[PDB]
Symmetry: none
Subunit: 46 residues, 35 copies
């Protein structure tokens, strides 16, 4: 008797890996939102 | 007196063996379903 | 006085012997039925 | 006085002897009937 | 004195011989019955 | 006066004895029929 | 004495052989059922 | 002495031949049963 | 001796073929479900 | 000698023919089940 | 002295000859019984 | 010397001939049994 | 010489005829079983 | 020879017809579910 | 000659008739299952 | 010299004639046995 | 010369007549078996 | 001449009568099976 | 002839009746779920 | 032949009717949520 | 003449009686499944 | 001249009469065999 | 002249009587088979 | 005159008695199947 | 006939009762969220 | 041999077609939700 | 006659008992989910 | 007279015993499914 | 004049007496056949 | 005057005595036939 | 006068005795069939 | 007197022994079915 | 002996391959949802 | 009878335990969000 | 008697073991989802 969840380990890792790209790249955009606001408020004060 | 379930032992093993292929290969596809969902939800959050 | 069931012993043995072939070979086919079903149900589950 | 049932003893023995052949050879055929039936029923079961 | 069961031996053998043909040829047909059933049940399972 | 059914007793015993062989050997074949069926049904269930 | 289960051996083999075709071809269709479902569920998730 | 099981050989062959037609034609119908079920289950899944 | 699973091969293929139509056409509808949802969620976000 | 499985060929064909009607008409109903479900799920999503 | 069992030899042969016709022709009919049964059982199985 | 089994040949043929009718007509009914069952099982599956 | 299987032909036909009624009427009931199930499953889906 | 799947055609049609009612009427209710939700979400937004 | 499948026609009709009651009354209950679910899901949405 | 087997010819014919009635009428009853069984088995299958 | 199979004709008819009652009444019971089964299976499906 | 199938008519009726009890009482139990399942599925849905 | 689906009508009604209790009482609980949520969201807004 | 989805039409309508109550009454509560918020924001502005 | 299905009536009743226990006790467990789920969903909402 | 078969006519009638009792009473027992089997098969089906 | 089938009437009755015991007691066991199955299927459903 | 079905009554009772053990013990195992499933579904829900 | 949904009524009530506790206690916490916010905004204004 | 998934192609298309209506009409409502929100926020800003 | 569903009552109770543990322990975890969320939202507000 | 269901009692117990292992070990795996889900949902909430 | 059938009466009685033993003892064995079958079928059902 | 049937009485007794041996010993063999058949049928049933 | 059915009593007992072995040993195998099935279904459920 | 069921005991044991192999090996395959499903559902949940 | 899961390996791969397309193409659309939202929020901030 | 939910109690506890870690650690991060905001607003005021 | 669920224990353990991998690895990905969100909200606040 035997089954193989050997293939799953390699495939799930991949999922984990892209989520990392989606997560990292997603964050890159929020930073544009955050920095532009600090600049807007700075002009906003004067 | 005598019968031969010698042939059966060799044949059943075969059944067991393909079930292993069907089972392993079947699992390979569910993994595509599972990983793609993690990716979909990741885009879904942001 | 005397009769001879000497010939019968040799002939009945033969009957017994073919029945063994018919019985063994018959079983060979049921095994095809049994193994194919295990495979069908395995595909049937997924 | 005298008669001779000397000849009869030798002749009756002969009768007894052929009956033995007819009886033994007759049985040889019933055996073909018996063995073939066991084979027919064996195929008949499967 | 003498009789001849010489002719009987040759004739009974013949009987035995045809019974063999009837028996062998009879069996040939049961085999058609047996094999077709295995095939019918195989289609019957799927 | 006298007759002799002395010879008959010895001869009938013989008949009884072969019937025993025919009966015992006949049974040997039915057993092949019986055991093979139990095996066929066992494969038949799975 | 003699019978011939020579013909049976050749005929039963044939039965065994078609069962193999029926079994193999039957499986070919279950695979269509299995693969289409994986595809249906994949669309079903998104 | 002589008998003729010459006629029997020709006649039994015929029996064997029709059994072949009955067997082949019978199978033709089970196939309709088998294929329609695969189709029914396929609609049944979706 | 002989049987014909020649007809079965041609008939099973047919089953396999329609299952393909049922499977392909079935999928065509899930796609309507999937695309409309992406559109619904898109309006749903704004 | 002769028998006639001429009548059987014509009659079995008929069986095969109705099975075709029962099979085709049966399928007509599963389609109502399948299409209505796609519609139910479509309303079910929105 | 002399008698003539010359005529008997020619006449008994004749008896033997018709018995052959009655025996051969009788067998022709049993064959119809045997073949029809194989056909009946074949329809009987399916 | 002479006897006449001339009449027997013509009469036995007749027996053989009706057996053919009884055999052929008997088979006609089993076919009704066989075809109706295929139809019953077909409705039975769906 | 002569016998009459004239009466048999007329009587067997009758058997064949009722079997037709039993077969046709039997089928009428399976249809109630089949149609009600399609309806039950239809309510069963929704 | 003859059977009648004439009655089946008329009866299956009926099954198909009610399934249509069950299917159409079932859908009528999902629409209440769908429309009420659009209304609930509309109040939900403001 | 004559038999009477007159009684059968009247009796089978009866079977058909109760099946109708069992079928109609059975359906009455599935409707309770179906309607209650629509109500449960309606409360389930809000 | 002379004897008269003239009367015998006319009388034996008569015997032959009644045997024909007994034979024909006897057969009439077996037909009731045969047809009723086909009907019993037909009800027996369904 | 003369014999009388006049009485036989009247008596055999009677046999034929009761067989008809036994046959008809026997069938009446199989119908109870058949109809009850259709009802059992109908409850069995739901 | 005369026989009496008068007693049979009264006795067969009895058989028919108990079969009715066995059939009616048997059905009483299937109903427990059917109703309990509807209840089980009803709890099963909620 | 006769069967009694009189008992079934009374028993199925019962099934229908409890399903009504299970269905009504089940709904009573969903209402607790629904009302509490409206209250939770109301506190949730302020 | 006949079934009755007459009862279903009357029962499904009922389902549709309560869903209307559940839907209408559900909406009554969202309105309390909506109006109170407009009031809260109005106090919130001043 | 006479048989006794008196014993059967008393025994079948018993069967019916246990089925009632199995059915009632079985339902007792589904209720645990149903109530726990309502509780799980209630915690699930908040 | 004269003989007397006057006594025979009266005595043969008697034989005929008892045969009637033996025949009628014999049949009474077969009926027990027949009815019990119908009952056994009825329990056998359910 | 005279014979006595007086003794037979009393003896046959006895046969009829035991057959009744064998028949009644035989049925007692089938009932155990029938009731246990209803119970097995009841556990089998849940 | 006399026979003894005294021994049969005692022996059949025994059969009935073991069937009771086989039936009771058989049921003991189905209960393991039933209870484990309720437990599996309970874990299955949460 | 009879089942018992007596136990269900008592058990469902219980479910309803805890849901009430879960619902009431859940609300107790939202109130902490609501009151603290009013306090936070009050400090927030000054 | 032949089946007809000709009818299915025409029926599935229909399913696909309504899904299109349900999908298009569903979207029509989300647009009301989307546009009204843009208007609400616009008043909300001033 | 007698069966024993005495053992079943004791065994089903057990099933009911574990379901209680699985149900109670399952709920213990949802509470962790519920309480942690109230805490998360509380930090979430400030 | 005597039979031995002594061996059966010991063997059935064994069946019951393994079912216990299969049942207990099966449950061990569902627990992995259940606990992992609680963990997944917990991460899913935050 | 005189003869003595005095001795015959005593001797025939004896014949009648042993037939009773052979008959009673013969029946003892059929009972083993009957009871074992009921047991075999009972295991056969489960 | 005188004759002597003194010698006959002693001699006939002897005849009677051997007939007893032939009769008793003959029966010994039929018993082998009877017992072996019971055994053959017993294997024949299973 | 005298015969001896003394030998028969001892011999029949023997038959009865082996039937007991054949019957007991036969049952031993059915138990393997029964227990393995319970195990197969247990794995079959999970 | 004597027979030999000595050979049967040794042969039946063999049957019992292979059934054990067929049973054990059969189970080996169901385990592949069971374990793969637990794995499929585990991927199925996430 | 032999089966062929050679065809399955090639077919499952295909399933896996399309799932990849459905998965990749599905993701393409979520990206439109994600990017448009970042843009909407960016306009939303200013 | 017996099952073991002993293992489940130990395993569920574990689930409960990690949820505690996930819940506690999750909260640790919200605190960073909360404290940083208080600091941001403090700088925001001056 | 004996079966072997020895192999099952070793195989089920394996299932349990992979489920552990699938469960542990699945969780690894949710953590990416959870941590990225905390980061997104943190940028989202400022």
């Amino acid at each position: 008797g035997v089954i193989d969840t050997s293939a799953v380990e390699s495939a799930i890792t991949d999922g984990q890996g892209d989520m990392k790209a989606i997560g990292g790249y997603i964050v890159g955009a929020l930073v544009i939102l955050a920095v532009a606001g600090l600049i807007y408020s700075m002009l906003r004060k004067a």
